Design a protein around this ligand. Sequence first.
Ligand SMILES: [Ca+2]
Ligand SMILES: [Ca+2]
Ligand SMILES: [Ca+2]
Ligand SMILES: [Ca+2]
Ligand SMILES: [Mn+2]
Ligand SMILES: [Mn+2]
Ligand SMILES: [Mn+2]
Ligand SMILES: [Mn+2]
Lengths: 237, 237, 237, 237
Amino acid sequence: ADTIVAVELDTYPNTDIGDPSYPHIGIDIKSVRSKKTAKWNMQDGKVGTAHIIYNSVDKRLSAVVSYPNADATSVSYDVDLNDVLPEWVRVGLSASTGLYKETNTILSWSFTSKLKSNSTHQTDALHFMFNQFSKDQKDLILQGDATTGTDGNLELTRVSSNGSPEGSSVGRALFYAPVHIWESSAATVSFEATFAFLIKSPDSHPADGIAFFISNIDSSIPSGSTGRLLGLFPDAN
Amino acid sequence: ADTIVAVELDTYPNTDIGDPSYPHIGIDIKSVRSKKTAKWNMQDGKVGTAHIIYNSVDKRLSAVVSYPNADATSVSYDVDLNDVLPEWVRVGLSASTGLYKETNTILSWSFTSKLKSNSTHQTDALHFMFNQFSKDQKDLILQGDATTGTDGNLELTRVSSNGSPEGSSVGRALFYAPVHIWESSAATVSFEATFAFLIKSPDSHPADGIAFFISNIDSSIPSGSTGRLLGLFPDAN
Amino acid sequence: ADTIVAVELDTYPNTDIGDPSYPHIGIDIKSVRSKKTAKWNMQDGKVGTAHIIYNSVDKRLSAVVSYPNADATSVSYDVDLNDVLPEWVRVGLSASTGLYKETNTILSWSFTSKLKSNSTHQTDALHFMFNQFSKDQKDLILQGDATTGTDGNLELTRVSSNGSPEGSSVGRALFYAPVHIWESSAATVSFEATFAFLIKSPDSHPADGIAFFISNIDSSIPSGSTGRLLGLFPDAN
Amino acid sequence: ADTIVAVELDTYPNTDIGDPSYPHIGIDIKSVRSKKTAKWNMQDGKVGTAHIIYNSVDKRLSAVVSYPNADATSVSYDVDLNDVLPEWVRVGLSASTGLYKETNTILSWSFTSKLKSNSTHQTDALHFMFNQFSKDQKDLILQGDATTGTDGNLELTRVSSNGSPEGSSVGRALFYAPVHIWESSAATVSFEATFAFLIKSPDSHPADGIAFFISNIDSSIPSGSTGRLLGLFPDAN
Ligand SMILES: [Ca+2]
Ligand SMILES: [Ca+2]
Ligand SMILES: [Ca+2]
Ligand SMILES: [Ca+2]
Ligand SMILES: [Mn+2]
Ligand SMILES: [Mn+2]
Ligand SMILES: [Mn+2]
Ligand SMILES: [Mn+2]
């Protein structure tokens, strides 16, 4: 079916589905129940930034979130990754809301991936960055409450005119253009993703979170992937 | 209809359609009849390389072809470009054959474009390079005699098993993913394309040429765009 | 002697030395008396951004300054450049003050240059960006009132503790590491520079300006290059 | 004193100094006696390519050598690195010869490093690539038998006019410009180095090897760092 491997920004502790006691960031492998996690003191009204890294060589999944003047969080997961995801995949981001609400916003999106080896010493690459999210991307793959064109930012969840974010939405955005993290002569595969985030929230118990993931090409939003589930996980934790 | 603006590598002088007396390189604007040209001493059996540049600021279309130890060619055309092509376009390459034959091969494909201004000081980009053209690109947009998977190269024209290139083909390859050379807060737009080429040819009168171009999204191959026409120009010079 | 070719941000009209009637930006070739200019409505207290571009091919010197929501300025000068500057040069920035005062500040510094051709299809490059200007760069070449380590910015002119900029200073900062814009097999040379600027100023007649330039390696500050002169021009307009 | 941390290409098994029974690649930390190693089947007369990677986050030292059609080698060492090397360092390459001889040649040199975090979301970078090693680099830091200007390559060891490599030499080349792998707001530091190599050798027992390393700024060649030692290790294994 539809598979995914992503890094989640869980501001809402959902201990039910083995979700911890506090808002955190975790690496989900085909599962919402992160394989690893790290306490994450969210910052209401502040601009954040998250970074991911992984080597075909080292075979490790690391990510780090942060805000200025503030101390950061670190978490890593050891994963070959070649047996999980396909040679050819797609990249995107998302976040859901259901019982409560919250803004789920990214002002910037930078993406680069490289493939090497082939001792041919050529290398094959794709990189790219955003910041002014106009209306009608075209190279953008928006699905759900996802919207574009408000203030040159990309807002994934439902928010009202004044600024009355809704809680029943789920936003998913993926690049129209695929990626390649394989290659026969593949003896080195690298990719780095780093996007900005502005997470407000009236309620003192913000929800439900934000992430980043890869997935099929014919990938579609989960049906009841609202709130925790994350809008990437098909239901069954 | 279908529009295009490209840089042509015409190894075959077709003076009929105002084509010069010798194999050359020219900039075609909605027309095969280059606006500018420059004598180009082709090199049979040798690896070449072509480069293009253009600034939203300077508003000039420059390209330069070359081989090692050998002297290069230069040609430029002054063109705003914002009134010709759409905000959103697609990028590709191609070449045709009809009366005669020839290989029309590129071993490498590098592409970068940047958009700036918005005094926001963010910038929005996309870059990427190829060299090992596997079978079933996916991020590749092949149309016609275009093929992939022979020796980690991209061969656009029809060539037989042994190596008996055909003469009735036309190969066009474009990136699956669109590009953006607009932007409201657009006060600077840049893009650089550079790919490799291996042009053999038994006959002492090789044909018919190779190029590079942008075009619509629903762009389709010309019908009788074989040989000179170039497989980008819809017939009517 | 000491030569320079730079792009000046003249907020102070000094018509005496053929300086126009209003604060502007101009391209100085061995001379302060810009070869070209363009009205420039400075923005007190606002963050700016300036961009430069030039091709060995097109052989044109273009730059563009701007702030958000605000309209930009454009100016270009046609200059081969290979007869002016040396194969090997150095890059930097500066600004002076003498009769009046003003802050002359850059928060960010991005720099890339490429050399191509050699039909070898290799290319030789150097790029780099700054934003958090710590104390004791080392890769930084500071001379004069130039300082580093205040708020992760690079302030070139003299400013007091509270924030009482002085008017008798001149700040020049250049990369410790040289550059190369030559090459025998040189048939294409490219470089792009873009840095941020925060220009305050109590007085309603700010001074004296900011720029960007290349120069010798044994380059040294002008003696009376205070104010207009610019701290790059050796005196004699 | 003079410290170094590098990746060695040991084609000569020197079991005496705990050097294995076969030509290999190993990571030397202040010591020649690699912390890790991996059998490496060298290819006489063939073009090679080596790659290194390390994250401030993952804190792992990985490198991979290879030639076309041929199977590669992998080796990694877990090393924070912040307690070993200084905030500010220099980058280079080298190789020695003493009892026997061999060419120790690199045709290409690509280098990029990034510093992030500061939740400021700016990042500070430096990248660059070579391939045509002209005479008198200037941005190059050559020491010893190191030479430049033969065929647009960088040859570090002594070789005669015809092509009669010597065996008593040692070549070290480092970038004139320093690097920065620190930063207070440092919560992510990345760098990737990849250069080409052509290792000939008449004798069926080539020697002595090639590497890559960082070190002090006032770094100087070892005195008896000929052969194994490597010309980076000060003698005392
Ligand atoms: Ca949760
Ligand atoms: Ca023709
Ligand atoms: Ca003035
Ligand atoms: Ca040894
Ligand atoms: Mn969770
Ligand atoms: Mn023509
Ligand atoms: Mn002026
Ligand atoms: Mn060893």
